[PDB]
């Protein structure tokens, strides 16, 4: 019941099964490919406080994976390390053979705690988590992944941004952005990676960082330089 697309004359036509068309020419298995695409390319929100809302925990359902031959470069990908309030791990260790997604411009690494009620974190829309040439129905601990879908057809540096959170598994989730080990700012859905990096440079340059052993949290004024009219990654 899985559709298979066929590309001819730069046109994508889904091949029917009920209607047999002699025109499709499969000469070798090298013409068959599994390609992973990211959800960011459809315009979904990518910012951490807006995307963790799409993930959630459940029990009684086992994980499954499939492989890829090719895929899209990601602007954004994630890496989670979430613990229960008592110190127990929420996410499972990745099994042998799982490695992080090979090409990301930004990695949003989130360290935190919360009410991790289920056994595994599943995607609520049915989308897959993408690892190095493997799509998975669940999130594995500590391993970088992109968020996306897979189609079947017949034919470098990155920046790590660190975040912290509490109440990770519920609606009242609080998020902070790390500037330094003792310096944080509040995170809001209006702050893109470029904004946040400019904000980080501004703080180091101004010197308004903790100079003691305790932590400091800054709020960002609601008036920001809103120069971008909700532009897509690609404009």
């Amino acid at each position: 019941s899985i559709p298979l697309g066929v590309i001819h004359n730069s046109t994508l036509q889904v091949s029917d099964v009920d209607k047999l068309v002699c025109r499709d020419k499969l000469s070798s298995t090298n013409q068959l490919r599994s390609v992973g695409l990211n959800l960011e390319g459809n315009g979904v929100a990518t910012d951490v406080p807006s995307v963790t809302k799409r993930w959630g925990f459940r029990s009684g359902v086992p994980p499954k994976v499939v492989n890829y031959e090719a895929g899209e470069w990601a602007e954004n990908c994630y890496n989670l390390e979430i613990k229960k309030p008592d110190g127990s791990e929420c996410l499972p260790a990745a099994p042998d053979g799982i490695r992080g997604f090979p090409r990301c411009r930004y990695v949003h690494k989130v360290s935190g705690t919360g009410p991790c009620a289920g056994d595994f974190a599943f995607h609520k829309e049915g989308a897959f988590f993408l690892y190095d040439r493997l799509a998975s129905t669940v999130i594995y601990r500590g391993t970088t992944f992109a968020e996306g879908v897979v189609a079947f057809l017949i034919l470098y540096y990155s920046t790590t941004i660190r975040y912290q959170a509490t109440g990770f598994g519920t609606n009242e989730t609080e998020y902070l952005f790390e500037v330094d080990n003792l310096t944080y700012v509040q995170l809001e859905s209006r702050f893109t990676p470029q904004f946040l990096l400019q904000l980080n440079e501004t703080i180091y340059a101004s010197g308004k960082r903790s100079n003691t052993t305790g932590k400091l949290i800054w709020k960002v004024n609601p008036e920001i330089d809103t120069t971008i009219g909700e532009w897509a990654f690609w404009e």
Epitope: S206, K208, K215, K219, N221, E223
Partner: antibody
Framework: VQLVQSGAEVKKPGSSVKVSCKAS????????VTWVRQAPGQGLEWMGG????????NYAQRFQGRVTITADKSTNTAYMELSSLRSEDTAVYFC?????????????????????WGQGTLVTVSS | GSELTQDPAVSVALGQTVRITCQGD??????ASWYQQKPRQAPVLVFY???NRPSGIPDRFSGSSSGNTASLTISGAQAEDEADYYC???????????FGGGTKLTVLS
């Protein structure tokens, strides 16, 4: 948003007092909960404060070793405990929500302010 | 933290403009917040940052700063503005909240 403090606490010297503060309309989130002291005829002294997000506390030097400040996020309340009360500690103790704010538009500016104040708790120490 | 300095008392004729000052190290690279305290009431935020105030504060209250000196301007001071006023900043070298001594503003009504 409101902060509700406990009523008057009157005790003899040598006793300890625990003054509560309850948030209403909001959780504490990542804001700072700070306590200050208003002695009769005086100005405002900083006593100390916490960040419930992390559970850390800081104190004004004159109260180090005398004051403990904690919080419970399941109730969105905070508590300040004073030990070894003396008559000079008679004062109204105030609970407030402190915001450390950075202005990122145009010129860069930094400032702090207390946005939400409780009504104050009178603590009287006398033999 | 280094303490802020304020003159203990200021008198203003009713209807006149009054300037309340604050000085110290915590004002050198920051802005002071100002509070109005009525008898038997919690301090009320009046003005903060470089240029704004919370709603509920009338357009009599505005202010500025330079160097290590900050001030609150009350234009057309009203009888209703009699209050203790306080400046507040943060001494980042100790991370202590610092209040000035305040001032008593007497409106000569």
């Amino acid at each position: 948003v409101q902060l509700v403090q406990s009523g008057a606490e009157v005790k003899k010297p040598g006793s300890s007092v625990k003054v509560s503060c309850k948030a209403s309309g909001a959780t504490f989130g990542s804001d700072t909960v700070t306590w200050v002291r208003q002695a009769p005829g005086q100005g405002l002294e900083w006593m100390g404060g916490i960040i419930p997000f992390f559970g850390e506390a800081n104190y004004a030097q004159r109260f180090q070793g005398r004051v403990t400040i904690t919080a419970d996020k399941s109730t969105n309340t905070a508590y300040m405990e004073l030990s070894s009360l003396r008559s000079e500690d008679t004062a109204v103790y105030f609970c407030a929500r402190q915001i450390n704010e950075m202005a990122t538009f145009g010129e860069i500016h930094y400032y702090t302010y207390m946005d939400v104040w409780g009504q104050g708790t009178l603590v009287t120490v006398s033999s | 933290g280094s303490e802020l300095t304020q003159d203990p008392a200021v008198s203003v004729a009713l209807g006149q403009t009054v300037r309340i000052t604050c000085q110290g190290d915590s004002l050198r690279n920051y802005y002071a917040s100002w509070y109005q305290q009525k008898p038997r009431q919690a301090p009320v935020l009046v003005f903060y940052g470089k240029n704004n105030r919370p709603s509920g504060i009338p357009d009599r209250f505005s202010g500025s700063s330079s160097g290590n000196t900050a001030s609150l301007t009350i234009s057309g001071a009203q009888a209703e503005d009699e209050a203790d006023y306080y400046c507040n900043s943060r001494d980042s070298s100790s991370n202590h909240l610092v209040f000035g001594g305040g001032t008593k503003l007497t409106v000569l009504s």
